[PDB]
Amino acid sequence: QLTAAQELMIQQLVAAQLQCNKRSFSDQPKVTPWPSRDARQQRFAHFTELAIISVQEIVDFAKQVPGFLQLGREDQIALLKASTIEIMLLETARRYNHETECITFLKDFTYSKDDFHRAGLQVEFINPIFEFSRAMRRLGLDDAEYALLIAINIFSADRPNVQEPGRVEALQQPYVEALLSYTRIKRPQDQLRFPRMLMKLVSLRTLSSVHSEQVFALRLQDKKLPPLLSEIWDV
Ligand SMILES: CC(C)N1C(=O)C(NC2CCN(c3ncc(CC(=O)O)cc3Cl)CC2)=C(c2ccccc2)S1(=O)=O
Ligand SMILES: CC(C)N1C(=O)C(NC2CCN(c3ncc(CC(=O)O)cc3Cl)CC2)=C(c2ccccc2)S1(=O)=O
Ligand SMILES: CC(C)N1C(=O)C(NC2CCN(c3ncc(CC(=O)O)cc3Cl)CC2)=C(c2ccccc2)S1(=O)=O
Numbered sequence: 001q002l003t004a005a006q007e008l009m010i011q012q013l014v015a016a017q018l019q020c021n022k023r024s025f026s027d028q029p030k031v032t033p034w035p036s037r038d039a040r041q042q043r044f045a046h047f048t049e050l051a052i053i054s055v056q057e058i059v060d061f062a063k064q065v066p067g068f069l070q071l072g073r074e075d076q077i078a079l080l081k082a083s084t085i086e087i088m089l090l091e092t093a094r095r096y097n098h099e100t101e102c103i104t105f106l107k108d109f110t111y112s113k114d115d116f117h118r119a120g121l122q123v124e125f126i127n128p129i130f131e132f133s134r135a136m137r138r139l140g141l142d143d144a145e146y147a148l149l150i151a152i153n154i155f156s157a158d159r160p161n162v163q164e165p166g167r168v169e170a171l172q173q174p175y176v177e178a179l180l181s182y183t184r185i186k187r188p189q190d191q192l193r194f195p196r197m198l199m200k201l202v203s204l205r206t207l208s209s210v211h212s213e214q215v216f217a218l219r220l221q222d223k224k225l226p227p228l229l230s231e232i233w234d235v
Contacts, residue, residue, distance in 0.1 A: 001185055006178045009066065013147035016064040024057045028106045040120075047119040048226055050105050051088070055228055058087050065151050067171040075163050081232050082159040085211045086204040087150055092129060093136035094146060103133065120223055125214040132203055139197060144182055151175040153201060 002010075031053070032045040062068050062080055071079070095104045104110045111119070116126045141149070155172035157165035176198075183194040215233045218225065225234060 002178075002181055005174075006181055009174070009178055010144050010148065010182065013065065013151060014143045016061055017143070017147050017150075020057045020060040020064075023060065024053050025106055027053050027056075031106075031109075034109060040118075043118050044120040044223060046109075047121075048229060050109070052226060052228055053106070054088050054091065055084060055232065058084055061150070062154055065154060068154065070171070071167065072163060074161070075168065078159050078161045078163075079154055079156065079168065082208070083154050083156065084232055085208050086153050086201075089129065089132060089204060089207050090136070090146065090150060090153070090200075093133040094141075096130075096133035096137055098134070098137055101130075120218070122214055122217055125210050128207055128210055132200075132207060135203070136200060139193065139200070141197070142186070145179065145197065148175055148179040148182065149197065149201070152179065153204065 031049045032042055034046050035042050059080065062076075062083075068076065068079075092103055096102075097104065097110075100110070100112075102110045102112050102115075113126055113130055116129070117123065139145075152172060152175045155168050155175065157169040157172065162168055179197070180194060183197070187193050212233075215225075216235075219234070224230070
């Protein structure tokens with residue numbers, strides 16, 4: 001029941017995500033290794049360097065999402081600035097292993113709740129990250145669903161400083177429609193899976209606020225973010 005346009009959109013997004021992720025994995029040897037003052041700073045550096053790799057992946061993917069380059073440069077910046085943390089959280093949830101209760105980045109960097117704390121994050125942010133990851137795991141999302149949810153997230157008309165919210169909302173719609181059609185085909189008996197997925201976008205907005213509080217807390221400790229992350233996250 002997918003239309004040709006929908007099938008093409010989905011296959012292209014999944015392929016784009018795969019290709020962008022292959023370029024991130026090539027960057028793995030760069031990151032400061034995971035291990036004392038030196039050790040504490042090394043753990044923090046490791047996490048922020050993984051984040052830089054993630055930001056570069058997100059930018060690379062966004063460029064390949066149909067419609068994104070039709071937006072003005074200022075709106076591209078506004079949307080990605082707000083979306084970045086939320087996409088990172090989706091990608092974090094995607095990498096969660098329930099058996100070990102650990103998250104795996106770049107194939108072989110695996111971290112528990114306590115490792116997140118040792119990297120310099122607050123329990124007020126870590127606990128909701130892991131709750132969100134558990135909730136996402138329950139949905140059993142496939143590559144198509146993750147790709148579509150990310151596209152939907154990017155085209156959020158209500159982000160601060162968006163100049164053309166009407167255009168953004170119009171570009172979002174086909175991805176919402178595609179996800180509706182896809183989920184109705186994949187699980188024709190589970191009608192509540194689709195709304196539960198969209199409710200995760202609601203959770204992401206809350207997590208963005210919790211993340212902003214985390215960023216503020218680092219400022220008081222003056223743990224300084226690298227320039228890319230500072231530009232996107234610091235006030
Ligand atoms: C490399 C990836 C991203 N590329 C593509 O994925 C793909 N799309 C598919 C088009 C139809 N397509 C199909 N999809 C689902 C089904 C569903 C079932 O099995 O019934 C059956 C088929 Cl044939 C195969 C390839 C491409 C393409 C589209 C149009 C013209 C030329 C290439 S591309 O190279 O840009
Ligand atoms: C503010 C500084 C301290 N913060 C951070 O430094 C950071 N680092 C992580 C960013 C996401 N992350 C990723 N790494 C690699 C990839 C690429 C792949 O694994 O293929 C994908 C992801 Cl999501 C791990 C490190 C954060 C974070 C952690 C969990 C969820 C969301 C954000 S934070 O914002 O608290
Ligand atoms: C606030 C200012 C300093 N900030 C920034 O300047 C900027 N850089 C932009 C440069 C790369 N990127 C793009 N540029 C051009 C194009 C257009 C084409 O390629 O033809 C398409 C894209 Cl995605 C978007 C973000 C940011 C950014 C970086 C990564 C992720 C999200 C936001 S920020 O908000 O910290």
